[PDB]
Each structure stands twice: as structure tokens, then as C-alpha cells.
Amino acid sequence: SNAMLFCDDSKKYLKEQNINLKNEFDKDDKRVEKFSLKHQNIYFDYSKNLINDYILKSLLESAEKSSLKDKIKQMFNGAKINSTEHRAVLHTALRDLSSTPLIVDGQDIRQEVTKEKQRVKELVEKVVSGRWRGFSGKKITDIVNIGIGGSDLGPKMVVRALQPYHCTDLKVHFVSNVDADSLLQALHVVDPETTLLIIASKSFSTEETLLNSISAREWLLDHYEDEKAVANHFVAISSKLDKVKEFGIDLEHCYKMWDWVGGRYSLWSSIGMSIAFAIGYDNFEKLLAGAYSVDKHFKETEFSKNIPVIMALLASYYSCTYNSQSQALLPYDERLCYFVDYLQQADMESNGKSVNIAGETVNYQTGVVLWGGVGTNGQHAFHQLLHQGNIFIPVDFIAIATSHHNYDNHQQALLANCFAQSQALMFGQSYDMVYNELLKSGLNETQAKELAAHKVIPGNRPSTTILLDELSPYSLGALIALYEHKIFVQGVLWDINSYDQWGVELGKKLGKNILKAMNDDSSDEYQNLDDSTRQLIAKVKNK
Amino acid sequence: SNAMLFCDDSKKYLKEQNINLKNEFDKDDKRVEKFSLKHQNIYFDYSKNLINDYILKSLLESAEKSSLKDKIKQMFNGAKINSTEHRAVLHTALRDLSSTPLIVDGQDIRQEVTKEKQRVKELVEKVVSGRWRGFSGKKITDIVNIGIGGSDLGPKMVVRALQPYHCTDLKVHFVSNVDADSLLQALHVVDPETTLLIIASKSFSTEETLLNSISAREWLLDHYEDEKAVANHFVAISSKLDKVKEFGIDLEHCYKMWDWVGGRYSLWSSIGMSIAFAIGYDNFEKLLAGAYSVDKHFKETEFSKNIPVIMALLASYYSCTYNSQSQALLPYDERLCYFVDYLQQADMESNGKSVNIAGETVNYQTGVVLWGGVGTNGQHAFHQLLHQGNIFIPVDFIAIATSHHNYDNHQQALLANCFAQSQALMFGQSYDMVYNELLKSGLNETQAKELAAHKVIPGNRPSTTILLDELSPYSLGALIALYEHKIFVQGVLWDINSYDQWGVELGKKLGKNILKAMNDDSSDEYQNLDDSTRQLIAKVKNK
Ligand SMILES: [Ca+2]
Ligand SMILES: [Ca+2]
């Protein structure tokens, strides 16, 4: 295509600068000032990355020469930047506070977002206040969200992350996998007379959600033995109005899903109602507002001071020039235990693409594996490989300055460990240092010589630390939005469509064919199987 | 060193075979028979890997030429194969059923394993039966395990994985992170008078566990106001007898940790007592027995029919010849939700090493990133990248033929999806196939031509499927042991020490120094900081 090539020959010459982090911090008393940014109460420290002024300048020039400035405007204005589906990409509009005019494919987006939020707010208030009653007349005590992917991970992550803010006296449960263990974990602990279930399914056709929904309905009706009970116990987030009505849900309680909201960008929409059912609508608004803060930052700030742009440039630089194939994300807070899982979908489902916008196969690597784990626990699981393995892996740390309790010694130790692990990545420890330490420990020269090489830690390994003041609805919204925009920037620089997901279609089709084969070994489906699939089906049956 | 080089020039010539999976299954009606194995009720299907007879033969010859045969014997016989620490590696002995003579560094390992298991069995029986009373005289209802890493992940994973088998009427809770949110999640839901806490800490010196232990003790004593209450409410798994006694624990209730049991191989030892507290000791014995079954398989079976050897060869072949830097593990069962987290420690902390046994820096890649996620959920998160990204990633699927409920339609759909995803990886879908499908869907030629390239799925991507009959204590033990031995084989072929973890020491040291600096900005520690660490500490304080 005619697009600027990001991963070009010039990028390799940047890495020949041979950056040594210890030397840079020693020589440059402005290093932190140069390579850190603030947005409100988020501090973004990228100074332990393998950059200097020349490398950063070069990368920023690539951003400036690219289509990025135009693409940011196009996203926010509702241009159809999801070019394979001919759709706008307007998750930003879900959290807008600017109130500027936005008319897209005939709809006043401001009015439609606002009116839908009012419907959800009113639902949550009616349920929490006890005005909503189940079919036997009882107040609701439990909410069960039924959805998968986009319709599960964001709500589940946010509900956990904001646990200190739970305030509705409702318990919220998440059913997702078609594996019935998921449904059963909820059903074992809820009462049909006091439970409200949410079916989150755009087309009412996602297989797992359909089976879970039907099985939930059967459970409810086994209790009540009256079809009319569905209306008091189920709501839907769907566009498939006929199937929602056929299930027995009142269309007053069918909530909107717009085509310009990708599933993996949908927690901000009515899909997030389970968040509001846990933390109340006021806190859901604060979540939205935090994201807006970052949207305004991203939209308005010159690239050299723009956090998501810097995040994207660093990531793409590493995966281009060091040929790295993964990135580690290390949240140093228990509350963020589903954060990595959530961003795996946002990042990998967006940028795991092999063709550009024009449909040409690209000759450079695109999205890499995102993985990681909560700290300090990861220090005792996989940090060994981060320190002494021989895989190049960029590392992001998320630190939270203050927690939600008064165990101040624990919080101090948590932070000290976070900072110590980035410092260890930067400095390492050399043979001479180790050898001298072993002698001082009481080993003799022979013993110290035999052991020291095994303790050497190469160091000079990069990291970024993102420090939040606290983990509140607002700050979490800001955090998630930073990564949403990082992912957007990377897709623009790689000239891919971050907003489609055609790769998942084949497995859905093959799954239907295999289900048919499992039920009828005379079928064309069974006959056409590869023999691996055929013998796996046989092993299952002859159990 | 003089060791055989696994990642040599020959390995590249194997990949020039240009294996095409579809063509192989079409041409070779023995493909599944050749490239599958059974161990009891586990079926191991590696036939969708990028191999043929010649490649597999070549790889097996490398195993046969290596030190592997000798090293397997040395492991089981108690030779000090952890050569940097001068230790035996005898997690196998923890689950032995052979009863053969084993005398290692003066101890009769058979007697010591058996006598310790009897102590744990008796503890669990005394607590579950109600004979154990808290300091106010009440029966125990809750167990809180306090540990991190090796002293947390295995027990936590197993307790969840075997949830259908819980039978003691005790609720078991896991406290690990120094982040006090971990401790608080347990303390919020337990009563000091009815809780028994386990301190799992080899030296009673692991920082997080020490802070958690002290804070738990303070909670207990805030209630009772009598130091004597500790003895009725705490047990320890530790070798540091003086510190255990000083804490107030009876040495009758200090359980053994042998130096030949690595933390990441320790769930089989007394460290696993929390498993027994959930599922009973009889089920813990079944877990052990399943692992023994695989130990006997591994120890006795020729390499061409040896599941862990084949697993190891395939993995190391890919990361050598395709230069892949990660592996995906996809368990198609909700119960296995912590399985990936557990194996990340077993694999990465073992094989993330940069020097060989002789201490020389190796010129080949060693352990890679292990990641993944439960199916079918991952299909809606990251499988897009597995199908259409441009990263080479080997894939393992774990399938369970029968579950623990009678929602047979759900179980069938779960399996059909599992098999469909490996079939999709193998076959993909070409431009012509897609284009014709789009025309049949009602698109015109222009529209179909514009879209088709975006739907192409390259295919020819490898996978292994491991099918268990059911997920029972025994089968789970077998499953974990298969991966333990895979990891061992890979470390032998790479001539590294899989059983040390020197890389984690530096961060512990730096963490102590940073704690001092956070408490005193006049200290040498604060003065010596890099300015990134210094400014992060400042941002925390001026919050
Ligand atoms: Ca420009
Ligand atoms: Ca031989």
C-alpha cells in the first residue's frame, strides 16, 4: 500500500545506539524529566526503556509522518475507520463529556448515548431500591450476567477491581463458558425467586450464550412452572428484538448495542450494566469520566507528550527491532487480577492481523502476545525468566500508591518490591559483584568460582512503571483508556484494521460440523473429517 | 561444554521438509496411529504437529544421543542433579508407590515420606472430625493457607480443579500477596475462634509470608488477648524450628520441607496439606497415585512411546527452528482456571536460564513464555491472534471427555469447540474458498473481492490435544506430572539446571534497600538510588 512503513531499515540503526540504562542515568541528570509524563494523578515513567533523545525523536518523527493525526480525528468524528465492516469506531462516544455535535449515520450520538444511560440508571435504581420484584413478589438479591468475551471480561474485571466500592447489596455473578460448570457455579448459590439474569448477546446467536440462556430459562421455569415468570427475571442487551421477545423478555428491558461499539470495547455501554449493579450508577459515571479524561488527553496532546502514543511507539519499536514476540504486564495490586485477561482480548483480538487495510499480506510482524501476572506473586512464579532467561520481553508495571486499608507496612512493602523489580531489570548483577559477595558469605575461591556464573543477572532490561494515586472508579477508567488508545496507535502505525475479527468465524463453522458428526457417524460431516478429529470424537464416545 | 547440542544446524533441515498438515492426513491413513499415544485413560494426540516420520525419527535420535537416559535414572535415584545447590531432585519420591530402596544423604526416603504423610493425615482427620478445638473450645470451620509461589499456586490450583470432590465441610482460603487485600479477603469471612491457619515458609524468612503471618497473628491476638491461643490456631510447614516455636506454634505441628523438594514441585509434599483439608486425605492419595502412574511411564518407557519426551522434543524443536518465543496452553474446562498460572511457575522458573551446567553463557534460546486461557472463553479473547496473527505459537489443548454434571448438551458443545479450534488451526480457509462463500452470501463480485483477503486464515498451524476421560484427583495428578517431566526433558536437552532459581535473589536485596530509602531520605540507600526509583518513591510520598 502507499502507507508509511513503520518497521523499516531505519529502526535497526536506532538499536545500534547500544543504550546502556545504568550509563544513561549516571550521565544524564534530566533522564527522568525527559522520559516521564503526568496525566492528572497518573504518573507515567518510561525512563527505564532502551531509548535516548535520538531514538525517541526518531520514533516520534515516524508518528508525525504517519496517518495518525488524521486517524485520531476520524475515530472521534465517526468516520468508518473499521473499513472491512464499514463501521464507525465510537467507544469514545460512550463516555463523552464534551457534548460537541456528533451525528453519525443519521443518529444523534450524544442523544442516543445519554438516553440509553438513563434507561440503565433507572433499571439499576428500580432493582436496588426494591421496586423491581420477582414473579413471586420478592426483592432481588443476586444478578447473573450471561455472556462471553466482550460480553463478560470487562464487566468481570471491573467488578473485581472496584470491589471496595460495592454498595448495592446485590451479589453479581458471571456465567460465560459453555462448560456447564460456569452456569452451575452461579445456580448453586442463587434462588430463582430473587435473581435477575442479564443475557448479553448482540444477535442472540452466540453459541455459548444461547445454551447458557436456555439452560437458565429451564432452571427458572422448573421452579415457577409458569412462562410468565421470565419477564420478572430476565433482561437482555441485544439488537435481535424478535428473539428477545420470543424468549419472554419485555422489550422495555431490551437494551441497546450499537454496531460502532466493538465487543472488546463495550464495558462502557449498556453491556457494563453489571458493573453498575455492583458499584451503583454514580460510580459507573466516575469510571466513564476517567476514561473521558484520557480521551481528551489523547485527542488534544502533541505526540511528544501523549501517553498512549509513547506507549505504542515503545511497544512497536521493541517488537520491530528486537524481534520480540510478547509483552509482560505486571499489576502490583490484587484487585487487578483480571486486568491482564481483559487486555489480552483488547490487544490481541485487535492487532493479531496478517493483512493491511488494502488486504495485502504484510511483511512485518504485527500484534504480539500479551501476558503477565499480579505482583508480588509473579516474582515467585515467572520473574526468574524475566531476570535470567534469554528472551527479550518489554515489561509494564502498574503500581497503586495508596490502597483501601490501613496495613501501611504491607502497602509500603508492595511498592518497594514493584520498584525493586524494575531496578533489578535495569541493573542486574555482574560476575565480579557476585563473586565478591560469595567470598564475603564464607565460600572459598573454588566454590565461589563454580557458583558465581549461575548468579549473574545480565540487566539492561527495559520497563515502564505506571503509577496511579489510588485504584478508584475514575482512575481505573483512565487506565483502561490508556491501553485502548495504545492499541489504536499501534494498529494505525502497522496499517491494519484493529476493529474487525474475521479469524474467529472458521472455528464457529467447524464446530457446527463437528457437533453434527458427533451425533451421526453416517453424516457427510463425519465422513469429511480429518482422522485426528474423528479419533478424538471416538475416544469421547467410547469412554 | 561437552554436552550434545540440541539446537544445531541439522534441526533447520528438518523444517525444510515443508510439512503440510492437510496433505499429510490426506496421504497417510496411519497418521493418527503413528502420532498418538495412550497412558491409561489419557490420550495424547500429537498428529496435528508439523512433523512426519523423518522429523520425529531425527528428534528421537537427538534424545537417544543425549544424556537423557542417564539423567532420568539419576533423578529417581537421588543423585545431586541440582548441581548449583548440590541437591537431589526428589519430588518423584513424594508420590512413590514402588517401595524400592532409596537411601539419600543418610535418610531412608521411603520411611521419611511415609511417616510425614501419616502426620498430615492425622492432622487433617483430627481437624475434620472436630477433635481439634480452637482456644475457646470450638470446632474448626475454615482453613487459611499463608504462602506465596511454590507455597500457594499448586494447592490453590488443585483445590479449584477438584472442587466437585470437596468433602470435609471446611472452607479453604489462600493468602499470598504482601498486598494486604489478599489477607483481608480471608479475614473478612473467617472467625478467629473457628479458623486454623497454615504458615508455609521453608525458612520463615520469605518477606510476604512473614508480613502476612505477623498480621494474621495480630488479628488472632486482638480477639483472644492471650498469646497461648496461637497454638490452637496455627501450624507451620517449615525447617526453621526456632522461629516457628518463637511464633507460638507447637513443634508437633511443624511439618517437614526437604531440600530435595523444589517449591515449584512441592504440592505433593506437606505443602499440599490444604488440598487434603478440602478433598480429604483419601483423595490426596489418589492425586499422588496419578502422578506415580506417569512417573512409572516416564522412567520405564522407550523414548518413541514416552509422552513427556515427545512433548519436550516438539516444544524444543519449535522454539529452536521456528524461533518461537511462547507456547499457548488452552484447558477446555473451567476447573482448570489456575492450571496455566501454575505451569508458568513450573516451566518458566525452571527453564528461564542463560547459562549451562558448566556456567557458560549458551548461544541458543532456552525456556520460552508459557501463557494461555480456558476454552471456550479464549476463543472470544485471543484465538483471533492464534488464527490470523503472524506469530508462530505452538498450542496444547486439554480436553476432558466427561464432566461432573448432566448438562450433556453443554459438554458436547465444549468438546466440539475444542476439536473445531485445532481443526481450524490445521486447515484455515483460502481466498478462493472465502470469495466463493461471499458470493453465495449475496455480495457482488466487487464487494467479495474487497473483503475476501481479510477473511483468509492461513492454517497449517500446529497443535497437540491431550484428552482425559474425566478430571479426577488421579487424572489431575497424572496431567501435572506429564508437564513436570516435559520440563525436565527440555532442561536436559538444553544442558541447563532446571532446579535452581538464582535470578530472584537480586530483587529481594534491592527491595530491602528501597524500603530503607522510603523510610529515610538521608540514608546511603536513598543517596545511591537511580533517579527513576527515587522519583517513584517521591510520587508515592507526596500523594
Ligand atoms: Ca505530519
Ligand atoms: Ca544413547
Which member of A389, A503, A513 has the closest CB to residue B353? A389
Angle between helices A307-321 and A273-300 (to 10 degrees): 80
Q: In the numeric block, which cell numbers belong to residue B379? A: 476463543
Strands lying side by side in the sheet with B195-200: B171-175, B142-146, B195-200, B234-237, B254-255
Q: Which amino acid is at B325?
A: Q
Judge contact between B183 and B216, C-beta under 8 A.
Answer: yes
Residue A7 and residue B390: Cα distance in Å, rounded? 14
Judge contact between B311 and B486, C-beta under 8 A.
Answer: yes
Judge contact between A471 and A331, C-beta under 8 A.
Answer: no
Handedness of CA A359, B389, A150, A491 (dihedral sign): negative
Q: Do domains A1-90+286-504 and A91-285 have the same CATH topology?
A: yes
* Closest of B244, B227, B236 to residue B197, by C-alpha: B236
Judge contact between A431 and A448, C-beta under 8 A.
Answer: no
Asked if the Cβ–Cβ distance from A422 to B366 is below 8 Å, we say no
- Show me where chain B is broken: residue before each gap, C-N > 2.5 A: none
Question: In angstroms, what separates the C-alpha of B27 from chain A's closest C-alpha?
Answer: 11
- Closest residue in A to B506 (Cα) is A424
Alpha helices (H) in A148-206, listed in sequence order: 153-161, 180-187
Residue B39 and residue B283: Cα distance in Å, rounded? 21
Contact map slice: B 250-279 vs A, CB within 8 A: 263
Judge contact between A316 and A493, C-beta under 8 A.
Answer: yes
Which member of A353, A412, A450 has the closest CB to residue B388? A353
Question: Mapping DSSP to helix (H, G, I), strand (E, B) and coil, where does residue B537 land?
Answer: helix
> For this experimental structure, what is the resolution in angstroms?
1.5
Q: In the numeric block, which cell numbers belong to residue B75? A: 533423578
Vertex A439, ends A435 and A441: CA angle to 5°?
Answer: 115
Q: Which ligand gives the minimal distance to the CA of B72? A: 2
Asked if the Cβ–Cβ distance from A467 to B536 is below 8 Å, we say yes
* Closest of A413, A383, A379 to residue B148, by C-alpha: A379
Furthest-apart CA atoms within chain B: distance in Å: 84
- Residues B371, B374, B380, B384, Cα dihedral to 10°: 40
Judge contact between B153 and B253, C-beta under 8 A.
Answer: no
Identify all chain A residues contacting B409, using CB atoms and an 8 Å cutoff: 211
Residue B317 and residue B444: Cα distance in Å, rounded? 45
Residue B484 and residue B474: Cα distance in Å, rounded? 16
* Per-residue buried b or exposed e for A171-196, using 16+ beta carbons within 10 Å of the residue's own CB: bbbbbbbbbbbbbbbbbeebebbbbb
DSSP letter assigned to residue A430: -
CA distances to A152, A236, A516, A541, B517 from B379, rounded to whole Å, are 13, 22, 20, 24, 46
* Closest of B24, B471, B483, B314 to residue A532, by C-alpha: B24
Interacting residues of B531 by C-beta distance below 8 A, sequence separation 6+: A25, A29, A31, A32, A47
Residue B40 and residue B43: Cα distance in Å, rounded? 8
Angle between helices B307-321 and B53-65 (to 10 degrees): 100
Residue B504 and residue B32: Cα distance in Å, rounded? 43
Strand partners, A415: none
Residue B415 and residue B471: Cα distance in Å, rounded? 14
* Closest of B507, B27, B290, B178 to residue A388, by C-alpha: B507
Q: Which ligand gives the minimal distance to the CA of B71? A: 2
Identify all chain A residues contacting B464, using CB atoms and an 8 Å cutoff: none
Judge contact between B377 and A152, C-beta under 8 A.
Answer: yes
- Residues A186, A188, A193, A198, Cα dihedral to 10°: 10
Q: Taking the domain B1-90+286-504, which CATH number applies? A: 3.40.50.10490
Asked if the Cβ–Cβ distance from A458 to B409 is below 8 Å, we say no
* Closest of A235, A22, A453, A299 to residue B1, by C-alpha: A453
Please give the distance, rounded to the nearest whole angstrom, from the Cα atom of residue B52 to the centre of ligand 2.
22
The residues of B annotated as belonging to the active site are 349, 380, 508
Identify all chain B residues contacting A508, using CB atoms and an 8 Å cutoff: 420
Which element (helix H / strand E) includes A108?
Answer: strand A107-108
* Residue B447 sits at the chain A interface (C-beta within 8 Å): no
Question: In angstroms, what separates the C-alpha of A415 from chain B's closest C-alpha?
Answer: 9
Residue A250 and residue A235: Cα distance in Å, rounded? 8
Asked if the Cβ–Cβ distance from A450 to B359 is below 8 Å, we say yes
Question: In angstroms, what separates the C-alpha of A262 from chain B's closest C-alpha?
Answer: 12
| Phi, psi for residue B508 in degrees, rounded to 5 | -70, -45
* Residue A440 sits at the chain B interface (C-beta within 8 Å): no
* Residue A533 sits at the chain B interface (C-beta within 8 Å): yes
- Closest residue in A to B417 (Cα) is A511
Asked if the Cβ–Cβ distance from A413 to B207 is below 8 Å, we say yes
Task: Please name the method used to determine this structure.
Answer: X-ray
Could you count the other beta carbons within 10 Å of the beta carbon of residue B387?
26
Judge contact between B471 and B333, C-beta under 8 A.
Answer: yes
Vertex B512, ends B507 and B513: CA angle to 5°?
Answer: 95
Angle between helices A53-65 and A473-493 (to 10 degrees): 70
Contact map slice: A 75-94 vs B, CB within 8 A: 84
Judge contact between B171 and B141, C-beta under 8 A.
Answer: yes
Residue B366 and residue A323: Cα distance in Å, rounded? 16
Measure CA B509 to chain center: 26
Question: Mapping DSSP to helix (H, G, I), strand (E, B) and coil, where does residue A281 land?
Answer: helix
Residue B541 burial by Cβ neighbours in a 10 Å radius (0-12, 13-18, 19+): exposed
CB pairs < 8 Å spanning A and B: 438
Give me the half-sphere count of Cα atoms (radius 13 Å) on the Cβ side of residue B521: 7
Vertex A162, ends A157 and A166: CA angle to 5°?
Answer: 120
What superfamily would CATH give domain B91-285? Glucose-6-phosphate isomerase like protein; domain 1 (3.40.50.10490)
Interacting residues of B174 by C-beta distance below 8 A, sequence separation 6+: B144, B145, B147, B152, B155, B156, B159, B186, B274
* Closest of A276, A286, A505 to residue B424, by C-alpha: A505
Q: Are strands B464-468 and B42-45 parallel, antiparallel or unpaired?
A: antiparallel
Neighbours of ion ligand 1 (CB under 5 A): A 64
Helix, strand, coil percentages, rounded to 5, for chain A: 55, 10, 35
Q: In the numeric block, which cell numbers belong to residue A507? A: 472455528
Which member of A414, A465, A505 has the closest CB to residue B178? A414
| Phi, psi for residue B283 in degrees, rounded to 5 | -70, -35
* Residue B542 sits at the chain A interface (C-beta within 8 Å): no
Q: In the numeric block, which cell numbers belong to residue A166? A: 460495592
* Closest of A161, A160, A418, A384 to residue B178, by C-alpha: A418
- Closest residue in B to A433 (Cα) is B506
* Residue A145 sits at the chain B interface (C-beta within 8 Å): no
Judge contact between A207 and A155, C-beta under 8 A.
Answer: no
Alpha helices (H) in A301-430, listed in sequence order: 307-321, 339-344, 350-351, 383-388, 408-427
* Residue A448 sits at the chain B interface (C-beta within 8 Å): no
So where are chain B's domains? 1-90+286-504, 91-285, 505-543
Residue A98 and residue A103: Cα distance in Å, rounded? 14
Judge contact between A340 and A157, C-beta under 8 A.
Answer: no
Vertex B69, ends B44 and B63: CA angle to 5°?
Answer: 60
Q: In the numeric block, which cell numbers belong to residue B242? A: 526456632
* Residue B417 sits at the chain A interface (C-beta within 8 Å): yes
Q: In the numeric block, which cell numbers belong to residue A428? A: 542486574
Question: Mapping DSSP to helix (H, G, I), strand (E, B) and coil, where does residue A189 land?
Answer: coil
For the domain made up of A505-543, the CATH class stated in words is mainly alpha
Vertex A416, ends A415 and A419: CA angle to 5°?
Answer: 85
Identify all chain B residues contacting A369, using CB atoms and an 8 Å cutoff: 326, 369, 371, 385, 391, 393
Question: In angstroms, what separates the C-alpha of A122 from chain B's closest C-alpha?
Answer: 30
Which member of B352, B407, B469 has the closest CB to residue A215? B407
* Residue A71 sits at the chain B interface (C-beta within 8 Å): no
Identify all chain A residues contacting B402, using CB atoms and an 8 Å cutoff: 543
| Phi, psi for residue A419 in degrees, rounded to 5 | -65, -35
Identify all chain B residues contacting A414, using CB atoms and an 8 Å cutoff: 177-179
Q: Is the peptide bond before B321 cis (omega within 30 degrees of 0)?
A: no
The residues of A annotated as belonging to the active site are 349, 380, 508
DSSP letter assigned to residue B517: H
Residue B37 and residue B26: Cα distance in Å, rounded? 21
CA distances to A83, A289, A342, B6 from A74, rounded to whole Å, are 12, 22, 26, 52
Vertex A476, ends A471 and A482: CA angle to 5°?
Answer: 130
Residue A342 and residue A350: Cα distance in Å, rounded? 12
